[PDB]
């Protein structure tokens, strides 16, 4: 679980979105595993606009933050679940670090702000859905 609150928006993993999120839907993309919904309260999370490949993510399964080196956003294949069939997930970044089901929604941040959220992992890896290209989150 976990979300990004920036201005009048809430960014969550699309597979974890609520009925309220869908009733106030702004944009969603199954290929990215993202959904953005509108909010009445003001969010103060700052989104990074950069090409950083180092950052710190929150890992709920360890209740700890971990520093990581991560790859640049790309199309990477993902297995199958009660949420999606076998597919390539776009705008995905990988890092060597611990993650297990339940860690989705954990924020990844660099010195510039919020980079993305945990969306997949396994075998000593962790995958993050990038949000740095969604320039409209800020205006």
Ligand X SMILES: NC(=O)[C@H]1CCCN(C(=O)CN2CCOc3ccc(Cl)cc32)C1
Extract the annotated binding site for Zn(2+).
50, 52, 110, 112
Pick one of 16, 52, 76, 78: the residue that binds Zn ion (CB under 5 A): 52
Per-position x/- string for 19-48, each x denoting binding to Zn ion as judged by CB under 5 A, each - no binding: -----------------------------x
Q: Does residue 78 belong to the site contacting ligand X (CB under 6 A)?
A: yes
Q: Does residue 104 belong to the site contacting ligand X (CB under 6 A)?
A: yes
Interatomic CA distance for residues 22 and 13, integer angstroms = 12
- Near ligand X by CB under 6 A, which window of 20-28, 52-60, 65-73, 112-120? 112-120
As measured in angstroms, the least distance from the Cβ of 52 to Zn ion is 3
Interatomic CA distance for residues 56 and 93, integer angstroms = 13
Q: Does residue 112 belong to the site contacting Zn ion (CB under 5 A)?
A: yes
| Dihedral, CA of residue 6, residue 128, residue 71 and residue 139, to nearest 10 | -20
Residue with the two structure tokens 């993202």: 34
Residue with the two structure tokens 């309220």: 20
- Near ligand X by CB under 6 A, which window of 38-46, 50-58, 66-74, 120-128? 120-128
Query: Strand ranges (DSSP E) for the chain?
Result: 4-13, 25-29, 34-44, 54-59, 64-69, 74-78, 87-96, 107-110, 113-122, 125-130
Whether 59 is catalytic: no
Tell how strand 4-13 and strand 34-44 pair up: antiparallel
Q: Which residues bind ligand X (CB under 6 A)?
A: 15, 33, 78, 81, 83-84, 89, 99-101, 103-104, 118-122
Q: Which residues bind Zn ion (CB under 5 A)?
A: 48, 50, 52, 110, 112
């Amino acid at each position: 679980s976990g979300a990004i609150y920036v201005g009048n928006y809430r960014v969550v993993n699309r597979h974890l979105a609520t009925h309220n999120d869908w009733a106030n839907l702004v944009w969603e993309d199954s290929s990215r595993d993202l959904l953005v919904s509108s909010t009445t309260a003001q969010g103060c999370d700052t989104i990074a606009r950069c090409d950083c490949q180092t950052g710190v993510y929150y890992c709920s399964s360890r209740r700890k933050h971990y520093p990581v080196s991560f790859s640049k956003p790309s199309l990477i294949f993902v297995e199958a679940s009660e949420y999606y069939p076998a597919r390539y997930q776009s705008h995905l970044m990988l890092a060597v670090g611990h993650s297990e089901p339940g860690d989705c929604g954990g924020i990844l941040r660099c010195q510039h702000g919020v980079v993305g959220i945990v969306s997949t992992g396994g075998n000593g890896l962790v995958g993050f859905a990038d949000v740095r290209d969604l320039l409209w989150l800020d205006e």
